[PDB]
Amino acid sequence: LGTELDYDTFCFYYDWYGSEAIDGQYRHWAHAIAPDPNGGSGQNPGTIPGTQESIASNFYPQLGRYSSSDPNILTKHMDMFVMARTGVLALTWWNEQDETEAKRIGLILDAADKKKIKVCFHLEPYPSRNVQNLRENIVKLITRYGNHPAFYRKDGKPLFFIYDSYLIEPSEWEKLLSPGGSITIRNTAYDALMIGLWTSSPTVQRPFILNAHFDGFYTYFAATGFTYGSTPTNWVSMQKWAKENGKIFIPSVGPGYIDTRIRPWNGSVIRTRTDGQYYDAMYRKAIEAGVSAISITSFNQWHEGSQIEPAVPYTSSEFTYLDYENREPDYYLTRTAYWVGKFRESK
Ligand SMILES: OC[C@H]1CC=C[C@@H](O[C@H]2O[C@H](CO)[C@@H](O)[C@H](O)[C@H]2O)[C@@H]1O
Numbered sequence: 001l002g003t004e005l006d007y008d009t010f011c012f013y014y015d016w017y018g019s020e021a022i023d024g025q026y027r028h029w030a031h032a033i034a035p036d037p038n039g040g041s042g043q044n045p046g047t048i049p050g051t052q053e054s055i056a057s058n059f060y061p062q063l064g065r066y067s068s069s070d071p072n073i074l075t076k077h078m079d080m081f082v083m084a085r086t087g088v089l090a091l092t093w094w095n096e097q098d099e100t101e102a103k104r105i106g107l108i109l110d111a112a113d114k115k116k117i118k119v120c121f122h123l124e125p126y127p128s129r130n131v132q133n134l135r136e137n138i139v140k141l142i143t144r145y146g147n148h149p150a151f152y153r154k155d156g157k158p159l160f161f162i163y164d165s166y167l168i169e170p171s172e173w174e175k176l177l178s179p180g181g182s183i184t185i186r187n188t189a190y191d192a193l194m195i196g197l198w199t200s201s202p203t204v205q206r207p208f209i210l211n212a213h214f215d216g217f218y219t220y221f222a223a224t225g226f227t228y229g230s231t232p233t234n235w236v237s238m239q240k241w242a243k244e245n246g247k248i249f250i251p252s253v254g255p256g257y258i259d260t261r262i263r264p265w266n267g268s269v270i271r272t273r274t275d276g277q278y279y280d281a282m283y284r285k286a287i288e289a290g291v292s293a294i295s296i297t298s299f300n301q302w303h304e305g306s307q308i309e310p311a312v313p314y315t316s317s318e319f320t321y322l323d324y325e326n327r328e329p330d331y332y333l334t335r336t337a338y339w340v341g342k343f344r345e346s347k
Pocket of ligand 1: 092122124125163262301303304
């Protein structure tokens with residue numbers, strides 16, 4: 001029918017939103033404003049309070065200041081994934097080690113399974129992250145969630161994305177990811193496809209990925225040109241290298257970027273949506289590169305204005321929000337479905 005989910009399409013999902021009613025605080029809708037890293041000492045940038053009128057986004061959610069732990073919001077999000085045809089929810093994971101995290105992960109898996117959506121984990125740069133506690137955490141996540149019907153596998157293996165994987169030396173990664181490594185996961189119950197973050201130039205990233213024994217790489221950033229890896233004119237050559245070296249390239253595409261409510265000094269990274277034309281151009285480049293899998297930045301990174309989740313026009317006494325302009329609130333979901341179709345036609 002051209003409506004089925006695609007299980008090689010990964011959409012980055014954030015579960016860090018709170019409401020006073022459910023979480024005791026409108027978590028993340030309230031957010032600190034970052035000081036300007038070039039702007040000198042004694043800045044008092046303040047905070048966005050997460051009131052109805054003033055939230056930590058340049059856009060405004062159709063669903064309002066929602067809780068990521070509200071089962072009724074989760075239902076709606078899964079129906080949005082079905083509309084977008086995105087079969088894998090790539091869940092931010094911060095190793096909070098608290099009952100609230102454990103509850104929310106279970107609720108997300110349960111809601112996903114009702115709609116045949118799958119869940120994989122996006123392993124964030126949590127405090128003191130290293131290959132030993134990464135192994136322990138991979139073991140824990142596979143043990144706790146690996147038998148859940150919504151847990152993702154690709155050809156029998158779990159898949160993890162590793163954000164800011166460059167913060168760990170290749171010599172450490174080798175211990176975890178080479179078949180001969182001291183603490184290897186290869187050939188164990190806990191083996192997985194490990195997808196590292198390709199940032200800078202090939203002279204740096206090619207030996208990094210090889211020496212670290214990653215199974216593949218992704219690029220994350222929604223803003224074209226932010227890094228070498230997030231410059232789509234490089235994607236044909238990145239794919240050629242991947243294929244020559246037995247690696248899985250999962251380029252990241254997004255609909256735009258803007259984070260100036262929380263980073264007022266970061267305007268150079270703004271990428272305008274142009275009624276969908278930015279998203280179309282980036283998704284076309286991914287497909288043309290001939291890749292096997294695509295990642296989407298993001299479902300709901302509202303702070304960075306990369307979300308495909310529905311947004312609505314809103315002007316409050318405190319801020320005039322951006323919105324989807326000439327397009328309807330669900331335009332980026334239905335346009336994602338269009339591109340998933342073009343991607344499948346290519347596979
Ligand atoms: O998921 C990978 C990566 C994507 C974007 C931002 C990163 O989080 C940091 O920035 C946000 C604001 O946009 C903060 O709310 C988080 O606390 C930061 O860690 C995220 O790691």
